[PDB]
Amino acid sequence: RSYRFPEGFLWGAATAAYQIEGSSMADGAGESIWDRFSHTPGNMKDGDTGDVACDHYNRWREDIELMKRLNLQAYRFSVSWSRVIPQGRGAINPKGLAFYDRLVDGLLEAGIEPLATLYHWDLPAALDDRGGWLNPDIADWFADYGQVLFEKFKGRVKTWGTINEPWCIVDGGYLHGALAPGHRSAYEAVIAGHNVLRAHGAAVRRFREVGEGQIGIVLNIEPKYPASDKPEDEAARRRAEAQMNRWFLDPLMGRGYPEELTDVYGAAWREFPKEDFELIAEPTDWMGLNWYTRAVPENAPDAWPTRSRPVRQTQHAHTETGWEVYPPALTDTLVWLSEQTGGKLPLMVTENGSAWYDPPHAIDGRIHDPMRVHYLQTHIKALHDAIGKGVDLRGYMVWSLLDNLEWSLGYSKRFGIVHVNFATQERTIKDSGLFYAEVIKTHGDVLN
Amino acid sequence: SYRFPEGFLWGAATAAYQIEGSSMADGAGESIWDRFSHTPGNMKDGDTGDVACDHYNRWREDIELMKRLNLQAYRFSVSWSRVIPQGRGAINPKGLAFYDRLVDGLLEAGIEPLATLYHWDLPAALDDRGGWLNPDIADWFADYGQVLFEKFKGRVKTWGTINEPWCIVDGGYLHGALAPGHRSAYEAVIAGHNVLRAHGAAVRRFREVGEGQIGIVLNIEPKYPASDKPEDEAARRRAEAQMNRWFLDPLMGRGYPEELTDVYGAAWREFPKEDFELIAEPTDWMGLNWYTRAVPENAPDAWPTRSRPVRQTQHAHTETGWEVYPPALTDTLVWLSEQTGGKLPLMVTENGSAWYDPPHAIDGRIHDPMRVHYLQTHIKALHDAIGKGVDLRGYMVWSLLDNLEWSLGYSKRFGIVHVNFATQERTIKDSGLFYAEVIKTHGDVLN
Amino acid sequence: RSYRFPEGFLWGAATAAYQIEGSSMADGAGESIWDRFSHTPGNMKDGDTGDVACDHYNRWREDIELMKRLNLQAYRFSVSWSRVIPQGRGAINPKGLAFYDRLVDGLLEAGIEPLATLYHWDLPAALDDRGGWLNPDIADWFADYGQVLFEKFKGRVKTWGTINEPWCIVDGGYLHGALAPGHRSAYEAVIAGHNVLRAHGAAVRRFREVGEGQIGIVLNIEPKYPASDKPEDEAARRRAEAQMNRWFLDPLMGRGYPEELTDVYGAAWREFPKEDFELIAEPTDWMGLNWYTRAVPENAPDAWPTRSRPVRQTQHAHTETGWEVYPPALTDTLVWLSEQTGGKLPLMVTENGSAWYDPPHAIDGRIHDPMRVHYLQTHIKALHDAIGKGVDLRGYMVWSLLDNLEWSLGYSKRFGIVHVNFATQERTIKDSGLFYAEVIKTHGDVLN
């Protein structure tokens, strides 16, 4: 059984601005919704904030040297909107843009492909004060923001993502309130989802006007498997599937909103103008998949609003975030996505990884994380199987390069293949990182 | 409005060798400045700290002067050699007793004593053992700190370890304009490292035997762009690294600035991992000494930073040749707030200006309108900094008294209280009167 | 009749190192064959040399400001091999490379696209002492030189030329001896042509291995028109055409060498190994055309070696270099070139312009060159006509930005749209430059 990957298959690792950078309001940087959210008591585990995080804003050079040691060919990162445009619209912050300028140049000098994400959940607070994702004008705001980047990094950043995981943004930020801006409303959730999609479309159009390279969205998908042969459980499964996996992909593919949403959101559901769906379906060049696990939903009449709940799969290992370890579901999902996009849209796994307990400090210069190593090897093999089934998969980014702030769960959830001692900011490459470096070097042959 | 936050602490600052006099009195040991000032050519007009403001004898009068100024805090330094004549070993009872009387007297007046362990006056006996080039000083200093920590436990609650490491090393070891007067990049690098280590050791000792809050005091001189030429920007970063980041960065656990490798060349050294662990020992507060900014340009022959300031002729300059530019204070405070992550309480431990005053009062008065101007504009700049979110807890004017400006002698007057050095007569300047009103109205006078 | 040019059509101007730089052996720079050639009595008109020229090595910043005043979107320039690698092989000269580093950064800062040429006739003398273009190893030497540039300017210089005018290099340098290195030999001409082609191929391969962007060769073409209906005149035309226009193009297109060359060079003609032609035909991304005029050849039995000679076309104006002004022949050539390359290869006019008399100094701050203006307007119109006929033309470079050293003809031939007072180095923009600036600004609409 060989596991060598296709020619040009791109290996990398991924991060997000608020999760690693720190210095969030430093050097002209504006206030974001997470600056506010994280400094409100009760919102974050242990009261953790992104004020310091991995101190990447100051230590990015060391981090690039770590990327080189891991033999990374690509680095997927996000740009903080509020760092570049403090009020979201209007005046640009030179020092903030200069940071990403230095960063990208440092990456290109290192021979590492910069993969940029425009929006990774850190909306400028000034725009939130204007309604945020509930305000349709954001479609323009986002576009303008996008333009600033497109022209600044023209010819340097060739691969662009617009939005990272619309579902987490809306479901977490507007439906249940576990993420910034911390609203809890189905009425708001429907609107927010729609305007996120519109914003994506607007950004793609603007990219066609002033940009260079390839642009696409990044979706998270969590495949829903049958819990039983009861029809109510299958209806539950389809509700969960529609709300999480089809909500955004379907209108992006020109199929409109899933009908089940009408049942999920009830009186909060809306019909939107026809031209909106034209904007939303703006042709893209590639698509990113963020993937971690599957779920096995059963009927749950009291679970708002999908009336479903996952059944614990005790036969398999679970991560520190409680996600089942089940690699075949990655293969299936990739196939499924290939099918939903007609096989014509180039795909990339922009996030995949696992959280396990690591000590807060290295132990004789090492971090032994055999379960993360196992997750890594089995899921990369699953990628190979998906490619063997005809999926046009061009690359793979491990989440994450560094142990970082796992948003509302704080620093307790370590996804890094590089350990960060948050007391000292010292980095230590984990066994998982060493092994991933081996996977890249052999282009997969080490899995043989 | 310019009313300051509740509990905001107003005061003035001094240093031992600059005001005390009686350097060899009552058991007091010899310091490096006793030697330095009595070597011809080192000091302007041959000035020494032998008499200075005679504060050792007139401290009560000086405290009454503090009361007339409505001071809520007094920042001062303790002479190491006055307390421990050989730097190590036997304590000098009378010398320590001076500071005992002083601190008790301050507390009687309702004035908070802010004590600095080291303000440039190393015991000469330790200098003969290598001074700041000897790593053992980290321990020596710690022991010295302990003596004070236990003696003034519960009375002095706010402690500074070292005052301006950059001036100590750059002036004392790199260029030799200050005691002990060495000129060596090699020694400068080693000395800087041992100064930081000594700070760390003193903080640990404070954790074990001390009570209250402890921190270091850094001077910062923000470096602004001279042009858009890239060599001038590289120059700017060399200067900034050598002066402003050399000490702050390792204190915040980020190691030494990369640029230093370029600045010091073959004189730069790698140090053991545990040293930086000692150096970044967590502090409770930080002092900023601030006076001005600089606008560095490339200067290949300027050793060792290869940079030089461009004279900013659009603005007023002090008698020490420092540009008057209050906005740079605001910026610096913000910058400092960001470098320390906002978690560390900041205090302006020194700010002020030197202008010419006559050697005597004029019908009971000293009119210093430019010092008044410096004061009001920079205090307003403090208010602006607080408005931008800086956790700034207080402000100490340099200086309470006209004093010995080290190698520049008595020619540079920084006092808000005038000292006639012929008669030791004190006269409160217009700047002092105004500062007293700033304190009493808690800033409202600035409206 | 509109003359708006295609979207993205690139307007610029061109120079060559020895023709403008001066400071030829300054800052570590090595001796080139033109250093030797120009300082040998009898070789150059009026004893002119490239010692000072336009003093561009010292005044490049002023020249960039001049480019900005002309609204240039691109600047085509060459890199002096001996300035960067003094002995042609071995140690790099840091100051020499630093000059082009500063130049390129300055160009990019001004928003001007740097178009770099590896070889513009100035071979390092040390390599000439090893046989120059007669030594097959030059293919390797050139490649190594190319690499130095490819990596130094990776991501900054995106458009690369390998060789500027193989025909002038070989015919002028080795066949007739009018150009450096001043050899006169058909045997040497055949060998040199072959090795120039090989060097191009080697540089393209090396570029594929370590470079980034688009790379191609630059050919001059002088279309040969019928003088009469006499068959010997048509045979003459075909000889001249084969020797000048098809000699290099055909093997570059994989068609081997023109059959007629066997007749032109006789006993000096040679057969070369088959793999050489695999190397020569290495796929390129674009091709440059240098174009000035046409010829009308007739039979001339005593003319060595093509046995042909041009018939003076007295019905048309001639430039000071004695070249007929006939704009339709430009259109024809482009079409011809489009046909020879199958329409698949993006083309750019890398040189076009004319030499007319100008005074040595400005006349009240002006230089009135109405014939150069005329040449410019008619030939640019001819470009538009060529595009209408299906030529995939992406850009146009005026030769030249500056009055410069016209090689063996010295400073007597002014090609600049910017006048250079060679006594004072004062630059004065000519009426032609003013007009060209308006052409760029209106993207061709001024021609309407």
Ligand SMILES: OC[C@H]1O[C@@H](O)[C@H](O)[C@@H](O)[C@@H]1O
């Ligand atoms: O939950 C772990 C990770 O999930 C991903 O889908 C998000 O993009 C990350 O920001 C997050 O850290």
Ligand SMILES: OC[C@H]1O[C@@H](O)[C@H](O)[C@@H](O)[C@@H]1O
């Ligand atoms: O130059 C004026 C003052 O600068 C301060 O930073 C030093 O601590 C003083 O000793 C000195 O007198």
Ligand SMILES: OC[C@H]1O[C@@H](O)[C@H](O)[C@@H](O)[C@@H]1O
């Ligand atoms: O012969 C005139 C011109 O011919 C061009 O094709 C060359 O590139 C130039 O260097 C030269 O000035």
